[PDB]
Amino acid sequence: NIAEAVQQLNHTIVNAAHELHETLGLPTPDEALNLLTEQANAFKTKIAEVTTSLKQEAEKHQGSVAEQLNAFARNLNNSIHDAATSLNLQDQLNSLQSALTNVGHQWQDIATKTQASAQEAWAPVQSALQEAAEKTKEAAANLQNSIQSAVQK
């Protein structure tokens, strides 16, 4: 189930990243920079939301799942914090593209983990993980919609 969610996330992310490159076709090298920074911030905002809600969840469980859950969240947060920092279009673009890529990889990691647990250890936090995956997918679809609408007018 998570597997699915996570698979759908990936596709989303992959595409979104492709589009990032079309920000370069914008009128000014300034317009785009502002656009990007904005988008990056919107994303960052959302990913951090998830991180916080998953941290909360972890607080309710025992064992290594809770540990690992809290960890995942922390990590998601680390791959985004510094993504709208660069002072130029170039670095900005690189930064976002990476940030996006790292969020996807981290999602795959945790998905695989849950899958490899024969004792079904992750079952107890499945809903939370799923919702979070959805929220991440939306953030990335939203971003894409933006890079798209700003390149059609």
Side-chain angles (χ1 to χ4, degrees), residues 27-60:
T28 313
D30 240 70
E31 200 144 348
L33 175 53
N34 256 273
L35 152 92
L36 246 38
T37 293
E38 187 163 89
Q39 292 313 303
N41 273 320
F43 192 68
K44 184 147 108 155
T45 284
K46 284 286 177 198
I47 288 271
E49 223 150 87
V50 170
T51 275
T52 295
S53 77
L54 245 20
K55 255 152 163 176
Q56 197 218 139
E57 190 62 20
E59 263 330 310
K60 327 191 164 160

PDB file of all heavy atoms in Angstrom, residues 27-60:
ATOM      1  N   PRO A  27      10.893  34.977 -19.127  1.00  0.00           N
ATOM      2  CA  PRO A  27      11.323  36.287 -19.570  1.00  0.00           C
ATOM      3  C   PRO A  27      12.662  36.735 -18.993  1.00  0.00           C
ATOM      4  O   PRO A  27      13.621  36.952 -19.722  1.00  0.00           O
ATOM      5  CB  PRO A  27      10.186  37.258 -19.241  1.00  0.00           C
ATOM      6  CG  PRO A  27       8.964  36.413 -18.878  1.00  0.00           C
ATOM      7  CD  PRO A  27       9.440  34.971 -18.757  1.00  0.00           C
ATOM      8  N   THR A  28      12.719  36.883 -17.671  1.00  0.00           N
ATOM      9  CA  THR A  28      13.954  37.297 -17.032  1.00  0.00           C
ATOM     10  C   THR A  28      14.568  36.198 -16.202  1.00  0.00           C
ATOM     11  O   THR A  28      13.870  35.232 -15.830  1.00  0.00           O
ATOM     12  CB  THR A  28      13.748  38.555 -16.145  1.00  0.00           C
ATOM     13  OG1 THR A  28      13.026  39.516 -16.856  1.00  0.00           O
ATOM     14  CG2 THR A  28      15.076  39.161 -15.606  1.00  0.00           C
ATOM     15  N   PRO A  29      15.874  36.303 -15.967  1.00  0.00           N
ATOM     16  CA  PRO A  29      16.602  35.353 -15.149  1.00  0.00           C
ATOM     17  C   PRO A  29      16.309  35.685 -13.684  1.00  0.00           C
ATOM     18  O   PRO A  29      16.700  34.985 -12.759  1.00  0.00           O
ATOM     19  CB  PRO A  29      18.119  35.470 -15.454  1.00  0.00           C
ATOM     20  CG  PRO A  29      18.284  36.611 -16.451  1.00  0.00           C
ATOM     21  CD  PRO A  29      16.865  37.104 -16.776  1.00  0.00           C
ATOM     22  N   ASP A  30      15.534  36.771 -13.492  1.00  0.00           N
ATOM     23  CA  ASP A  30      15.076  37.258 -12.189  1.00  0.00           C
ATOM     24  C   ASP A  30      13.687  36.697 -11.850  1.00  0.00           C
ATOM     25  O   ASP A  30      13.426  36.177 -10.765  1.00  0.00           O
ATOM     26  CB  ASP A  30      14.886  38.779 -12.289  1.00  0.00           C
ATOM     27  CG  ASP A  30      15.745  39.503 -11.327  1.00  0.00           C
ATOM     28  OD1 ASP A  30      17.010  39.413 -11.666  1.00  0.00           O
ATOM     29  OD2 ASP A  30      15.306  40.073 -10.329  1.00  0.00           O
ATOM     30  N   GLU A  31      12.792  36.832 -12.805  1.00  0.00           N
ATOM     31  CA  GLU A  31      11.438  36.355 -12.671  1.00  0.00           C
ATOM     32  C   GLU A  31      11.434  34.918 -12.211  1.00  0.00           C
ATOM     33  O   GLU A  31      10.740  34.525 -11.270  1.00  0.00           O
ATOM     34  CB  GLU A  31      10.923  36.324 -14.119  1.00  0.00           C
ATOM     35  CG  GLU A  31       9.402  36.329 -14.320  1.00  0.00           C
ATOM     36  CD  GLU A  31       8.995  37.130 -15.545  1.00  0.00           C
ATOM     37  OE1 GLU A  31       9.975  37.868 -16.055  1.00  0.00           O
ATOM     38  OE2 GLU A  31       7.863  37.072 -16.027  1.00  0.00           O
ATOM     39  N   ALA A  32      12.199  34.133 -12.933  1.00  0.00           N
ATOM     40  CA  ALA A  32      12.308  32.730 -12.657  1.00  0.00           C
ATOM     41  C   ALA A  32      12.859  32.465 -11.273  1.00  0.00           C
ATOM     42  O   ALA A  32      12.353  31.630 -10.526  1.00  0.00           O
ATOM     43  CB  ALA A  32      13.205  32.161 -13.710  1.00  0.00           C
ATOM     44  N   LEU A  33      13.916  33.191 -10.938  1.00  0.00           N
ATOM     45  CA  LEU A  33      14.542  33.017  -9.644  1.00  0.00           C
ATOM     46  C   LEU A  33      13.584  33.211  -8.496  1.00  0.00           C
ATOM     47  O   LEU A  33      13.651  32.529  -7.479  1.00  0.00           O
ATOM     48  CB  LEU A  33      15.713  33.971  -9.442  1.00  0.00           C
ATOM     49  CG  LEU A  33      16.385  33.978  -8.060  1.00  0.00           C
ATOM     50  CD1 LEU A  33      16.812  32.566  -7.642  1.00  0.00           C
ATOM     51  CD2 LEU A  33      17.626  34.814  -8.213  1.00  0.00           C
ATOM     52  N   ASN A  34      12.690  34.175  -8.661  1.00  0.00           N
ATOM     53  CA  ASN A  34      11.721  34.516  -7.661  1.00  0.00           C
ATOM     54  C   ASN A  34      10.637  33.458  -7.606  1.00  0.00           C
ATOM     55  O   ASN A  34      10.169  33.038  -6.535  1.00  0.00           O
ATOM     56  CB  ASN A  34      11.173  35.917  -7.987  1.00  0.00           C
ATOM     57  CG  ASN A  34      11.745  36.966  -7.072  1.00  0.00           C
ATOM     58  OD1 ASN A  34      11.217  37.223  -5.988  1.00  0.00           O
ATOM     59  ND2 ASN A  34      12.840  37.566  -7.504  1.00  0.00           N
ATOM     60  N   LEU A  35      10.298  32.990  -8.808  1.00  0.00           N
ATOM     61  CA  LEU A  35       9.316  31.940  -8.937  1.00  0.00           C
ATOM     62  C   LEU A  35       9.796  30.697  -8.172  1.00  0.00           C
ATOM     63  O   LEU A  35       9.167  30.176  -7.244  1.00  0.00           O
ATOM     64  CB  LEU A  35       9.072  31.654 -10.449  1.00  0.00           C
ATOM     65  CG  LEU A  35       8.630  30.218 -10.745  1.00  0.00           C
ATOM     66  CD1 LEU A  35       7.122  30.110 -10.751  1.00  0.00           C
ATOM     67  CD2 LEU A  35       9.128  29.682 -12.056  1.00  0.00           C
ATOM     68  N   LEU A  36      10.966  30.231  -8.551  1.00  0.00           N
ATOM     69  CA  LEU A  36      11.588  29.098  -7.935  1.00  0.00           C
ATOM     70  C   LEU A  36      11.693  29.210  -6.409  1.00  0.00           C
ATOM     71  O   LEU A  36      11.318  28.297  -5.664  1.00  0.00           O
ATOM     72  CB  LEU A  36      13.007  29.060  -8.589  1.00  0.00           C
ATOM     73  CG  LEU A  36      13.193  27.832  -9.444  1.00  0.00           C
ATOM     74  CD1 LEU A  36      11.870  27.602 -10.120  1.00  0.00           C
ATOM     75  CD2 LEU A  36      14.298  28.015 -10.442  1.00  0.00           C
ATOM     76  N   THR A  37      12.251  30.321  -5.966  1.00  0.00           N
ATOM     77  CA  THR A  37      12.453  30.478  -4.558  1.00  0.00           C
ATOM     78  C   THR A  37      11.184  30.285  -3.808  1.00  0.00           C
ATOM     79  O   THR A  37      11.144  29.654  -2.758  1.00  0.00           O
ATOM     80  CB  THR A  37      13.050  31.782  -4.241  1.00  0.00           C
ATOM     81  OG1 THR A  37      14.344  31.751  -4.789  1.00  0.00           O
ATOM     82  CG2 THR A  37      13.206  31.741  -2.727  1.00  0.00           C
ATOM     83  N   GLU A  38      10.156  30.827  -4.417  1.00  0.00           N
ATOM     84  CA  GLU A  38       8.828  30.749  -3.867  1.00  0.00           C
ATOM     85  C   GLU A  38       8.363  29.326  -3.765  1.00  0.00           C
ATOM     86  O   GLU A  38       7.985  28.834  -2.705  1.00  0.00           O
ATOM     87  CB  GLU A  38       7.900  31.507  -4.811  1.00  0.00           C
ATOM     88  CG  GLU A  38       6.491  31.654  -4.248  1.00  0.00           C
ATOM     89  CD  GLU A  38       5.705  32.713  -4.964  1.00  0.00           C
ATOM     90  OE1 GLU A  38       5.027  32.503  -5.947  1.00  0.00           O
ATOM     91  OE2 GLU A  38       5.839  33.925  -4.416  1.00  0.00           O
ATOM     92  N   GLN A  39       8.388  28.665  -4.898  1.00  0.00           N
ATOM     93  CA  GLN A  39       7.980  27.288  -4.960  1.00  0.00           C
ATOM     94  C   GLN A  39       8.755  26.420  -3.986  1.00  0.00           C
ATOM     95  O   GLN A  39       8.193  25.586  -3.268  1.00  0.00           O
ATOM     96  CB  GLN A  39       8.184  26.858  -6.410  1.00  0.00           C
ATOM     97  CG  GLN A  39       7.164  27.606  -7.256  1.00  0.00           C
ATOM     98  CD  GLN A  39       5.807  27.493  -6.591  1.00  0.00           C
ATOM     99  OE1 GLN A  39       5.310  26.386  -6.342  1.00  0.00           O
ATOM    100  NE2 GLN A  39       5.209  28.637  -6.273  1.00  0.00           N
ATOM    101  N   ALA A  40      10.055  26.615  -3.982  1.00  0.00           N
ATOM    102  CA  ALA A  40      10.868  25.859  -3.080  1.00  0.00           C
ATOM    103  C   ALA A  40      10.395  26.069  -1.652  1.00  0.00           C
ATOM    104  O   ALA A  40      10.348  25.158  -0.835  1.00  0.00           O
ATOM    105  CB  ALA A  40      12.258  26.381  -3.255  1.00  0.00           C
ATOM    106  N   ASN A  41      10.022  27.295  -1.353  1.00  0.00           N
ATOM    107  CA  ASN A  41       9.592  27.565  -0.022  1.00  0.00           C
ATOM    108  C   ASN A  41       8.270  26.934   0.300  1.00  0.00           C
ATOM    109  O   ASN A  41       8.029  26.503   1.415  1.00  0.00           O
ATOM    110  CB  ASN A  41       9.648  29.038   0.318  1.00  0.00           C
ATOM    111  CG  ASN A  41      10.997  29.492   0.844  1.00  0.00           C
ATOM    112  OD1 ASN A  41      11.667  28.785   1.648  1.00  0.00           O
ATOM    113  ND2 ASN A  41      11.405  30.678   0.414  1.00  0.00           N
ATOM    114  N   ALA A  42       7.404  26.885  -0.696  1.00  0.00           N
ATOM    115  CA  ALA A  42       6.102  26.283  -0.480  1.00  0.00           C
ATOM    116  C   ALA A  42       6.229  24.792  -0.164  1.00  0.00           C
ATOM    117  O   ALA A  42       5.559  24.257   0.720  1.00  0.00           O
ATOM    118  CB  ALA A  42       5.321  26.515  -1.741  1.00  0.00           C
ATOM    119  N   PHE A  43       7.121  24.140  -0.893  1.00  0.00           N
ATOM    120  CA  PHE A  43       7.390  22.742  -0.739  1.00  0.00           C
ATOM    121  C   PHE A  43       7.966  22.455   0.601  1.00  0.00           C
ATOM    122  O   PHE A  43       7.486  21.629   1.395  1.00  0.00           O
ATOM    123  CB  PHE A  43       8.494  22.479  -1.769  1.00  0.00           C
ATOM    124  CG  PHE A  43       8.724  21.028  -1.989  1.00  0.00           C
ATOM    125  CD1 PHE A  43       7.767  20.234  -2.612  1.00  0.00           C
ATOM    126  CD2 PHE A  43       9.888  20.423  -1.525  1.00  0.00           C
ATOM    127  CE1 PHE A  43       7.952  18.865  -2.787  1.00  0.00           C
ATOM    128  CE2 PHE A  43      10.079  19.052  -1.667  1.00  0.00           C
ATOM    129  CZ  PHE A  43       9.105  18.268  -2.284  1.00  0.00           C
ATOM    130  N   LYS A  44       9.054  23.168   0.833  1.00  0.00           N
ATOM    131  CA  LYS A  44       9.772  23.009   2.073  1.00  0.00           C
ATOM    132  C   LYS A  44       8.780  23.040   3.214  1.00  0.00           C
ATOM    133  O   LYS A  44       8.840  22.276   4.174  1.00  0.00           O
ATOM    134  CB  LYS A  44      10.664  24.234   2.068  1.00  0.00           C
ATOM    135  CG  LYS A  44      11.683  24.435   3.165  1.00  0.00           C
ATOM    136  CD  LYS A  44      12.937  25.146   2.659  1.00  0.00           C
ATOM    137  CE  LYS A  44      13.125  26.613   3.111  1.00  0.00           C
ATOM    138  NZ  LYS A  44      14.533  27.043   3.117  1.00  0.00           N
ATOM    139  N   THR A  45       7.856  23.981   3.097  1.00  0.00           N
ATOM    140  CA  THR A  45       6.838  24.222   4.124  1.00  0.00           C
ATOM    141  C   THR A  45       5.989  23.013   4.395  1.00  0.00           C
ATOM    142  O   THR A  45       5.669  22.678   5.525  1.00  0.00           O
ATOM    143  CB  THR A  45       5.996  25.490   3.837  1.00  0.00           C
ATOM    144  OG1 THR A  45       6.695  26.679   4.125  1.00  0.00           O
ATOM    145  CG2 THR A  45       4.608  25.504   4.446  1.00  0.00           C
ATOM    146  N   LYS A  46       5.564  22.402   3.304  1.00  0.00           N
ATOM    147  CA  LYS A  46       4.738  21.232   3.362  1.00  0.00           C
ATOM    148  C   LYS A  46       5.493  20.017   3.916  1.00  0.00           C
ATOM    149  O   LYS A  46       4.985  19.335   4.800  1.00  0.00           O
ATOM    150  CB  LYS A  46       4.157  20.954   1.999  1.00  0.00           C
ATOM    151  CG  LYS A  46       3.025  21.902   1.680  1.00  0.00           C
ATOM    152  CD  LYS A  46       1.782  21.562   2.459  1.00  0.00           C
ATOM    153  CE  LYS A  46       0.633  22.540   2.227  1.00  0.00           C
ATOM    154  NZ  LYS A  46      -0.429  22.497   3.248  1.00  0.00           N
ATOM    155  N   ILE A  47       6.698  19.737   3.397  1.00  0.00           N
ATOM    156  CA  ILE A  47       7.528  18.623   3.856  1.00  0.00           C
ATOM    157  C   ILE A  47       7.851  18.700   5.337  1.00  0.00           C
ATOM    158  O   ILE A  47       7.932  17.714   6.075  1.00  0.00           O
ATOM    159  CB  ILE A  47       8.835  18.582   3.083  1.00  0.00           C
ATOM    160  CG1 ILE A  47       8.437  18.107   1.705  1.00  0.00           C
ATOM    161  CG2 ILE A  47       9.811  17.600   3.720  1.00  0.00           C
ATOM    162  CD1 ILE A  47       8.472  16.587   1.618  1.00  0.00           C
ATOM    163  N   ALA A  48       8.030  19.906   5.792  1.00  0.00           N
ATOM    164  CA  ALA A  48       8.283  20.082   7.187  1.00  0.00           C
ATOM    165  C   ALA A  48       7.022  19.773   8.014  1.00  0.00           C
ATOM    166  O   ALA A  48       7.078  19.379   9.181  1.00  0.00           O
ATOM    167  CB  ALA A  48       8.748  21.522   7.330  1.00  0.00           C
ATOM    168  N   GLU A  49       5.856  19.957   7.401  1.00  0.00           N
ATOM    169  CA  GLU A  49       4.607  19.686   8.084  1.00  0.00           C
ATOM    170  C   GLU A  49       4.494  18.225   8.425  1.00  0.00           C
ATOM    171  O   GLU A  49       4.128  17.857   9.543  1.00  0.00           O
ATOM    172  CB  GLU A  49       3.413  20.032   7.191  1.00  0.00           C
ATOM    173  CG  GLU A  49       2.268  20.767   7.886  1.00  0.00           C
ATOM    174  CD  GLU A  49       1.557  21.670   6.925  1.00  0.00           C
ATOM    175  OE1 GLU A  49       0.659  21.293   6.225  1.00  0.00           O
ATOM    176  OE2 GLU A  49       2.080  22.896   6.933  1.00  0.00           O
ATOM    177  N   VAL A  50       4.799  17.406   7.415  1.00  0.00           N
ATOM    178  CA  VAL A  50       4.794  15.967   7.461  1.00  0.00           C
ATOM    179  C   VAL A  50       5.742  15.504   8.531  1.00  0.00           C
ATOM    180  O   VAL A  50       5.387  14.771   9.459  1.00  0.00           O
ATOM    181  CB  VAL A  50       5.323  15.493   6.090  1.00  0.00           C
ATOM    182  CG1 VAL A  50       5.601  14.031   6.045  1.00  0.00           C
ATOM    183  CG2 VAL A  50       4.332  15.832   5.026  1.00  0.00           C
ATOM    184  N   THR A  51       6.981  15.972   8.416  1.00  0.00           N
ATOM    185  CA  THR A  51       8.000  15.652   9.384  1.00  0.00           C
ATOM    186  C   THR A  51       7.511  15.807  10.811  1.00  0.00           C
ATOM    187  O   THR A  51       7.751  14.971  11.670  1.00  0.00           O
ATOM    188  CB  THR A  51       9.132  16.633   9.133  1.00  0.00           C
ATOM    189  OG1 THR A  51       9.951  16.126   8.106  1.00  0.00           O
ATOM    190  CG2 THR A  51       9.900  16.780  10.407  1.00  0.00           C
ATOM    191  N   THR A  52       6.795  16.901  11.058  1.00  0.00           N
ATOM    192  CA  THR A  52       6.247  17.192  12.367  1.00  0.00           C
ATOM    193  C   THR A  52       5.122  16.270  12.766  1.00  0.00           C
ATOM    194  O   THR A  52       4.996  15.826  13.893  1.00  0.00           O
ATOM    195  CB  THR A  52       5.838  18.657  12.454  1.00  0.00           C
ATOM    196  OG1 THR A  52       7.045  19.358  12.349  1.00  0.00           O
ATOM    197  CG2 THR A  52       5.206  18.928  13.801  1.00  0.00           C
ATOM    198  N   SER A  53       4.310  15.926  11.818  1.00  0.00           N
ATOM    199  CA  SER A  53       3.238  15.057  12.200  1.00  0.00           C
ATOM    200  C   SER A  53       3.679  13.616  12.407  1.00  0.00           C
ATOM    201  O   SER A  53       3.074  12.865  13.161  1.00  0.00           O
ATOM    202  CB  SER A  53       2.142  15.219  11.177  1.00  0.00           C
ATOM    203  OG  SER A  53       2.509  14.517  10.039  1.00  0.00           O
ATOM    204  N   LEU A  54       4.751  13.223  11.756  1.00  0.00           N
ATOM    205  CA  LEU A  54       5.282  11.882  11.891  1.00  0.00           C
ATOM    206  C   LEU A  54       6.090  11.787  13.170  1.00  0.00           C
ATOM    207  O   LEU A  54       6.177  10.749  13.806  1.00  0.00           O
ATOM    208  CB  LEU A  54       6.302  11.725  10.750  1.00  0.00           C
ATOM    209  CG  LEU A  54       6.066  10.718   9.635  1.00  0.00           C
ATOM    210  CD1 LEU A  54       4.636  10.333   9.533  1.00  0.00           C
ATOM    211  CD2 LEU A  54       6.557  11.370   8.360  1.00  0.00           C
ATOM    212  N   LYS A  55       6.714  12.894  13.548  1.00  0.00           N
ATOM    213  CA  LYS A  55       7.466  12.885  14.769  1.00  0.00           C
ATOM    214  C   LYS A  55       6.489  12.570  15.923  1.00  0.00           C
ATOM    215  O   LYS A  55       6.791  11.855  16.867  1.00  0.00           O
ATOM    216  CB  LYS A  55       8.105  14.257  14.972  1.00  0.00           C
ATOM    217  CG  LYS A  55       9.596  14.292  14.689  1.00  0.00           C
ATOM    218  CD  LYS A  55      10.093  15.654  14.224  1.00  0.00           C
ATOM    219  CE  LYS A  55      11.599  15.763  14.342  1.00  0.00           C
ATOM    220  NZ  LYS A  55      12.143  17.019  13.829  1.00  0.00           N
ATOM    221  N   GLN A  56       5.301  13.148  15.791  1.00  0.00           N
ATOM    222  CA  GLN A  56       4.227  13.023  16.773  1.00  0.00           C
ATOM    223  C   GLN A  56       3.715  11.619  16.904  1.00  0.00           C
ATOM    224  O   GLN A  56       3.411  11.102  17.981  1.00  0.00           O
ATOM    225  CB  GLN A  56       3.064  13.856  16.245  1.00  0.00           C
ATOM    226  CG  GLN A  56       2.057  14.147  17.352  1.00  0.00           C
ATOM    227  CD  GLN A  56       0.654  14.100  16.832  1.00  0.00           C
ATOM    228  OE1 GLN A  56      -0.209  13.571  17.521  1.00  0.00           O
ATOM    229  NE2 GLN A  56       0.461  14.642  15.618  1.00  0.00           N
ATOM    230  N   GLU A  57       3.626  11.011  15.760  1.00  0.00           N
ATOM    231  CA  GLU A  57       3.183   9.658  15.712  1.00  0.00           C
ATOM    232  C   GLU A  57       4.163   8.756  16.445  1.00  0.00           C
ATOM    233  O   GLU A  57       3.787   7.909  17.254  1.00  0.00           O
ATOM    234  CB  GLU A  57       3.122   9.280  14.241  1.00  0.00           C
ATOM    235  CG  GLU A  57       2.421   7.937  14.002  1.00  0.00           C
ATOM    236  CD  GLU A  57       1.000   7.961  14.450  1.00  0.00           C
ATOM    237  OE1 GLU A  57       0.357   8.997  14.611  1.00  0.00           O
ATOM    238  OE2 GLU A  57       0.539   6.750  14.652  1.00  0.00           O
ATOM    239  N   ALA A  58       5.438   8.964  16.147  1.00  0.00           N
ATOM    240  CA  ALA A  58       6.484   8.160  16.727  1.00  0.00           C
ATOM    241  C   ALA A  58       6.375   8.137  18.236  1.00  0.00           C
ATOM    242  O   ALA A  58       6.710   7.157  18.885  1.00  0.00           O
ATOM    243  CB  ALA A  58       7.830   8.725  16.281  1.00  0.00           C
ATOM    244  N   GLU A  59       5.915   9.247  18.765  1.00  0.00           N
ATOM    245  CA  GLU A  59       5.782   9.404  20.182  1.00  0.00           C
ATOM    246  C   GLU A  59       4.799   8.436  20.764  1.00  0.00           C
ATOM    247  O   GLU A  59       4.785   8.223  21.971  1.00  0.00           O
ATOM    248  CB  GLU A  59       5.188  10.785  20.514  1.00  0.00           C
ATOM    249  CG  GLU A  59       6.208  11.840  20.865  1.00  0.00           C
ATOM    250  CD  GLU A  59       7.465  11.334  21.519  1.00  0.00           C
ATOM    251  OE1 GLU A  59       7.238  10.534  22.526  1.00  0.00           O
ATOM    252  OE2 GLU A  59       8.590  11.719  21.213  1.00  0.00           O
ATOM    253  N   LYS A  60       3.942   7.898  19.916  1.00  0.00           N
ATOM    254  CA  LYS A  60       2.918   6.987  20.413  1.00  0.00           C
ATOM    255  C   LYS A  60       3.275   5.522  20.381  1.00  0.00           C
ATOM    256  O   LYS A  60       2.584   4.709  20.982  1.00  0.00           O
ATOM    257  CB  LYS A  60       1.683   7.021  19.599  1.00  0.00           C
ATOM    258  CG  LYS A  60       1.404   8.373  19.034  1.00  0.00           C
ATOM    259  CD  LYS A  60       0.014   8.396  18.462  1.00  0.00           C
ATOM    260  CE  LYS A  60      -0.521   9.796  18.197  1.00  0.00           C
ATOM    261  NZ  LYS A  60      -1.646   9.788  17.236  1.00  0.00           N
TER     262      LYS A  60
END
